[PDB]
Amino acid sequence: EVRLVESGGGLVKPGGSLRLSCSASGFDFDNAWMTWVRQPPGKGLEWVGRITGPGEGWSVDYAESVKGRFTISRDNTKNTLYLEMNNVRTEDTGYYFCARTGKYYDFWSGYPPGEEYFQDWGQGTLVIVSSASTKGPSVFPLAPSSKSTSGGTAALGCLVKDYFPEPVTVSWNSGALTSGVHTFPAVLQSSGLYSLSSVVTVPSSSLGTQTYICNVNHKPSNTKVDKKVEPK
Amino acid sequence: SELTQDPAVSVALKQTVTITCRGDSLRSFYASWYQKKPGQAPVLLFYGKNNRPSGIPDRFSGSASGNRASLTITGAQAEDEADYYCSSRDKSGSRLSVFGGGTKLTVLSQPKAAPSVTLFPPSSEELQANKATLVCLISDFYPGAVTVAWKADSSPVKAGVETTTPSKQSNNKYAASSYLSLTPEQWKSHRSYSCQVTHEGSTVEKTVAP
């Protein structure tokens, strides 16, 4: 019956402020310790901070990476935990989770109160830190070459650089070419802008004859780019 | 980075796998362990000396010896494929907590498979825009975990690198991509750059030159 639900994620610019909320039910929130954890894109879980109960005076501790910039607080009348994110940095991008927290102890085995553990978690809320506004992609060919070819198969593609926000969609030959196509997930770069690539593996015999065109759609910028990709 | 874990391990069905975190604070503290699947909240699997929350299958067990905390899955099952994180104190006398880097556990459905690697140099067109991106595309590998190392000449390059998490392609095998951003002068000033992909302790290195 324990439920944790984070809210407030969204886009914020470096130096900006954002407040996240975590609503709780199904347990005694008043006396529960509550922790914030985050996960950057493609990275591991990182401990952000924890707020104790009234026995410890609602004491708060913070990871050195956020100390002085984030503030954790709670409003027990609403069963809500908050994370006030200030002076945000690109490195704060990620999913933020709240977790009902216990402190491990075992009188029988003489283990004194020790490490904390995270008994129940919400699904997280996404924060994206970027100074960017809408920005269409630049598209460059990944031209097929002796280096991109292994005998009878050649790789070619399109590099879609420095756009914002997501999403970009890529087709090949207006959707007529799907076999051997992989469009990769975007990378959010330190710049606050996205880049991705689309690759197609095709018959090397076909390179002289067949046209290969990547169709890049970035609807947020109202941009479409078609790039015919040929050998160099 | 006070708790360190190998980034990837694989296990065959019904076999036993141990995922281990190493840290100085683990000599004095037990560690708790968490399972994380894409799109899902982390779940607490085990903590303390011998505590397994209700609902967690008993094939997960935590142990500790020296500076190592270990989660052993005795008889892996397909649904155990997940990232696994440990957590403990960063240090004795600390009110802070820390997580290990995470271990991706693949539960093999298949024999392992080596990657194919294609490295594209910057296009002349991108250089004309005063930019330069090397694109290292990696395909067909299993388990879906690789390590990517870039080099300028023979010297490791860590700045300017962005790498995607492997994801399945339309053919059900994994692909990943890595990017090295350089200035056009950096690209032209070296003899070569290289993209080295390590998978199951074997490596494939592609090299390009301006």
Residue numbers in the entry:
A (entry chain H): 1 to 52, 52A, 52B, 52C, 53 to 82, 82A, 82B, 82C, ...
B (entry chain L): 2 to 9, 11 to 95, 95A, 95B, 95C, 96 to 209
Authors' description from the paper:
In addition, as Masiero et al. recently reported that His148LC (the equivalent of His31 of 10E8v4) in a trispecific antibody is an essential residue for activity, we determined the crystal structure of 10E8v4 with His31LCPhe mutation, and found that the hydrogen-bonding network observed in wild type was no longer maintained in the 10E8v4-H31FLC. As a result, its CDR H3 showed an “open” conformation deviated from that of 10E8v4 with an RMSD of 3.1 Å, SEC behavior close to the wild-type, though with reduced affinity and potency. Masiero et al. also propose the light chain His148 of 10E8v4 Fab in a trispecific antibody (the equivalent of His31LC in 10E8v4) to be the switch site for pH-dependent cis-trans isomerization. We observed mutation of His31LC to Ala or Phe to reduce affinity to the gp41 epitope, to abrogate neutralization potency against all tested viruses, and to yield single peak SEC behavior with the CDR H3-YPP motif intact, in support of this proposal. Overall, our results suggest the protonated state of His31LC in acidic pH can lead to a “closed” CDR H3 conformation by strengthening the interaction between His31LC and the YPP motif with the hydrogen bonds involving two carbonyl oxygens (Y100e and G100h) and a hydroxyl group from Glu100iHC. Crystal structures of P100fA, P100gA, P100fgAA and H31LCF variants all showed “open” CDR H3 conformations, which correlated with reduced affinity to gp41, reduced neutralizing potency against select viruses, and reduced affinity to the column matrix. Furthermore, the crystal structures of di-proline variants, 100fA, 100gA and 100fgAA, and light chain variant, His31Phe, revealed how the YPP motif and the hydrogen bonds between the CDR H3 and the CDR L1 contributed to make the alternative conformation of the CDR H3 incompatible with gp41 recognition, providing the structural basis for the reduced binding affinity to the gp41 MPER peptide and the reduced potency against select viruses.
